[PDB]
Amino acid sequence: RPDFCLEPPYTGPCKARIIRYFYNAKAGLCQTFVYGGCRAKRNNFKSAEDCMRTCG
Amino acid sequence: IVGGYTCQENSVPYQVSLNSGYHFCGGSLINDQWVVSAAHCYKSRIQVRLGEHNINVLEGNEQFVNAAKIIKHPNFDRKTLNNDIMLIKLSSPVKLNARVATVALPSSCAPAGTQCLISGWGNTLSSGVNEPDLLQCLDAPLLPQADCEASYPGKITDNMVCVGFLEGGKDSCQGDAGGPVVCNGELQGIVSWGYGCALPDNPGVYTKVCNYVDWIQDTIAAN
Ligand SMILES: [Ca+2]
């Protein structure tokens, strides 16, 4: 699978509280984390489906 | 808010919560129909909650009002976070009382060393996650621009100001964005960004409100 899928979730420097999905390689599944609101990395999805399709 | 304390119930009447299903940002009421927040808190649909203390329990003093217009600063930069400010016009004027009040716009730019009050319902831990039910408060000073630039080499613009402590321990965090930094009764800053939370040598960075008073007033008078 793509390399960015193996990277840990990146909250970013912004301080909003936005729930996003990321692929957790360790558990082999997509879960949620708190995204700050800016400068997102690729392992950041607005839905579980998009996450599973891209990183599954 | 990391390292702060629970605010006295309704001692921060100008604080509001931005909600789109759940609390995601803070804001400040500047007049009966307008709220100021951070541009990165932008959402197409937003409900403003005022008179809040315990964000998860219906207390009876709250007012729920939908946003009618959302206006971000035209020069906001999603990458550098320069001009991180946004105005929200409410669908209808709110009722002003002891629990819901406005905060004044700055008369001038406050000097470094000025003690301020920061508030919000954001994360309370530097490592891990703990979202509080009750509004948190933090007393912190405006830092010299030189120390701000030293902490964030080449990332600070004239529209930003650092507030907090270089030793870390106390700071704003995720969930606090858009919130108020009030000094001597005036809104001098808006919670914006930072590297991590309460980390040494990385105090929070805030939007310097005094540079936008005219834009705010002109925007409100035109909409
Ligand atoms: Ca409540």
UniProtKB/Swiss-Prot annotation, chain A:
It comes from the Eukaryota. It is found in: Secreted. Inhibits trypsin, kallikrein, chymotrypsin, and plasmin. Disulfide bonds join C5-C55, C14-C38, C30-C51. Its main location: secreted. GO terms for molecular function: calcium ion binding; molecular function inhibitor activity; potassium channel inhibitor activity; protease binding; serine-type endopeptidase inhibitor activity; sulfate binding; zymogen binding. Keywords: Disulfide bond, Pharmaceutical, Protease inhibitor, Secreted, Serine protease inhibitor, Signal. The record marks K15, A16 as: Reactive bond for trypsin. This is Pancreatic trypsin inhibitor. It comes from Bos taurus (Bovine). GO terms for biological process: negative regulation of platelet aggregation; negative regulation of serine-type endopeptidase activity; negative regulation of thrombin-activated receptor signaling pathway; trypsinogen activation. One of its GO terms (cellular component) is serine protease inhibitor complex. Residues 5-55 form the BPTI/Kunitz inhibitor domain.
Curated annotation (Swiss-Prot), chain B:
Ca(2+) binds at E52, N54, V57, E62. Residues 1-221 form the Peptidase S1 domain. It catalyses: Preferential cleavage: Arg-|-Xaa, Lys-|-Xaa. It is an enzyme of class 3 (hydrolase). It comes from the Eukaryota. Keywords: Calcium, Digestion, Disulfide bond, Hydrolase, Metal-binding, Protease, Secreted, Serine protease, Signal, Zymogen. It is found in: Secreted, Extracellular space. Its EC number is 3.4.21.4. Binds 1 Ca(2+) ion per subunit. PANTHER family: PROTEASE, SERINE 1 (TRYPSIN 1)-RELATED (PTHR24264:SF10), TRYPSIN-RELATED (PTHR24264). This is Anionic trypsin-2. It comes from Rattus norvegicus (Rat). The gene is Prss2.
